[PDB]
Amino acid sequence: PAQVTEAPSSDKTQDRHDFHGQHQSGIVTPRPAAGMLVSFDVLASDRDDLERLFRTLDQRIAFLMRGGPVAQVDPKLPPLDSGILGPVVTPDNLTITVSVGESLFDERFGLEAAKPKRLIRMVGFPNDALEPACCHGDLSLQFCSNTADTNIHALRDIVKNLPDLLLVRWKQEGSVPPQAPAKPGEPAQSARNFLGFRDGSANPDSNDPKAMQQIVWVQPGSDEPAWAAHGSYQAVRIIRNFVERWDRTPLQEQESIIGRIKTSGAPMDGQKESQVPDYARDPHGKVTKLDAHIRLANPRTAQSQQNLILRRPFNYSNGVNKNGQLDMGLLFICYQADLEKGFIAVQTRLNGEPLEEYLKPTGGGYFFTLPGVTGEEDFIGRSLLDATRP
Ligand code: HEM
């Protein structure tokens, strides 16, 4: 039998994803079990310092996502790697996604003229209780992998190799519950959040490139800057869950507020999770309440298909509040080709929803995910630099 401190066995340690591609990974990539979002301040003095930060991030993310033996150096020097994952780094399904904030487009690096048209500093919503220390940032990194230790090891590599260029503003890790393999012929399910409901059922088809080019990815023919093609707006919201009050809530109230059955994830007029409700035949809200979460987030009209988003959240759990209740909730992360048409328009409709009785957004921010690195001569943010050079 294994000794107490012997490491747990994993067969997913060589899971991997391409770093290069037209898009950055970690958006349409299948979401792994561990997630982490770190927001930084860019300490770069000029554009050359920003270029060094970009090319360094490109080199570090490429190796971290590929894995391999870490070179050994003179013992008088610090180790090249933290060693959390051993002498040979394992990918372990890791993806690191880079996004730039609105504050980066100030007078510091001359990028003000090429800012994405809908990239703004996040403004608080009526139900928000935002903490300024956990809001905004020059740059955001999204770490997703099979384990939090792979994520934390990836964070340690970034901060070690960029000590004078990156200052960590705020961070929030999270996870989703894995499930047993689906039996043949039975459709798989979305992961459940800390409210007990399946999260992401009505997400657009990530296998439909036309749908992704319509909802998620900035297209070159749009009114956005030319460099921003194949990027995406990233919205982050740390939303608290008042789980004790929610667990005391009757089941029928839970389902009538969200708009879906808890067990099956089905719509109020359907039977399976993959089904969508028919609002036109229910104009008064007898089946699905007019203030349901999914009904408010998606009226499913023709005028609302421009407000669809790709949600990619995690469930977070921190300490315990002094009042006695647990600080846990949803690490909300969603992507959209248009931030104003996407998250901003949807959250506006959700304002005042009966779900707000159990929600409390306390932080997050808006960022624009840079386009993907296409080849060995491209790097993270090169298109942004070249489009703004005098
Ligand atoms: C804070 C910003 C949020 C936005 C913009 C948002 C948006 C959406 C959207 C667009 C849908 C799809 C509805 C449809 O297409 O029919 C949805 C569904 C859903 N949301 Fe949210 N949501 C947010 C927060 C939350 C939170 C905090 C929770 C729970 C703690 C939650 C739980 C759910 C559930 C259970 C569903 C049904 C399953 C699904 O289709 O994903 N949402 N939401």
What letter would DSSP give residue 173?
Answer: E
Query: In this structure, what token pair is assigned to residue 50?
Result: 């920003």
Distance CA 191, CA 173 (A): 17
Distance CA 18, CA 29 (A): 10
In whole angstroms, how far apart are CA 30 and each of 44, 153, 228?
A: 33, 21, 23
How much distance in Å is there from the Cα of 188 to the middle of ligand 1?
Answer: 19
Q: Please tell me if the CB atom of residue 202 comes closer than 6 angstroms to any atom of ligand 1.
A: yes
CA angle (386, 341, 345) in 5-degree steps: 135
Q: Write down the residue that tokens 């490429």 correspond to.
A: 62
User: Residues 385, 53: contact at Cβ < 8 Å?
Assistant: no
3-state secondary structure of 333: strand
User: Residues 331, 314: contact at Cβ < 8 Å?
Assistant: yes
User: Atom 37, ligand 1: which residue's CA is nearest?
Assistant: 199
Among 106, 176, 188, 121, which Cα is nearest to 148's? 176
- Experimental determination approach used: X-ray
Q: Please tell me if the CB atom of residue 332 comes closer than 6 angstroms to any atom of ligand 1.
A: yes
User: Residues 231, 369: contact at Cβ < 8 Å?
Assistant: yes
* Residue 2 in domain: no
Query: In this structure, what token pair is assigned to residue 83?
Result: 């060693």
Distance CA 86, CA 377 (A): 30
Distance CA 194, CA 317 (A): 9
User: Residues 312, 192: contact at Cβ < 8 Å?
Assistant: no
User: Residues 60, 83: contact at Cβ < 8 Å?
Assistant: no
Distance CA 234, CA 88 (A): 32
Q: Write down the residue that tokens 């990530």 correspond to.
A: 206
* Residue 20 in domain: no
How much distance in Å is there from the Cα of 62 to the middle of ligand 1?
Answer: 33
Among 186, 202, 195, which Cα is nearest to 277's? 202
Q: What DSSP string runs through 77-123? A: SPPSS--TT-SEE--TT-EEEEEEEGGGGSSSSS-GGG--TT--PPP
List the domain range (segments joined by +) for residue 107: 34-177+191-385
* Residue 325 in domain: yes
Q: Please tell me if the CB atom of residue 359 comes closer than 6 angstroms to any atom of ligand 1.
A: yes
Domains: count for the chain: 1
* Residue 214 in domain: yes
Q: Please tell me if the CB atom of residue 239 comes closer than 6 angstroms to any atom of ligand 1.
A: yes
* Residue 17 in domain: no
Distance CA 246, CA 243 (A): 5
User: Atom 19, ligand 1: which residue's CA is nearest?
Assistant: 294
CB atoms within 10 A of CB 261: 19
* Residue 139 in domain: yes
- What's the alpha-carbon Rg for the chain, to the nearest Å? 22
* Residue 169 in domain: yes
User: Residues 116, 368: contact at Cβ < 8 Å?
Assistant: yes
User: Residues 361, 240: contact at Cβ < 8 Å?
Assistant: yes
Q: Write down the residue that tokens 């070249």 correspond to.
A: 386
Please, what is the angle between helix 47-66 and helix 148-161, to 10°?
150
How much distance in Å is there from the Cα of 344 to the middle of ligand 1?
Answer: 14
Query: In this structure, what token pair is assigned to residue 42?
Result: 């860019």
User: Atom 6, ligand 1: which residue's CA is nearest?
Assistant: 297
Distance CA 224, CA 237 (A): 24
166-180: b or e for each residue (b if 16 or more CB lie within 10 Å)?
beebbebbbbbeeee
Q: Please tell me if the CB atom of residue 297 comes closer than 6 angstroms to any atom of ligand 1.
A: yes
* Residue 18 in domain: no
Q: Please tell me if the CB atom of residue 330 comes closer than 6 angstroms to any atom of ligand 1.
A: yes
How much distance in Å is there from the Cα of 240 to the middle of ligand 1?
Answer: 14
Query: In this structure, what token pair is assigned to residue 18?
Result: 């391409």
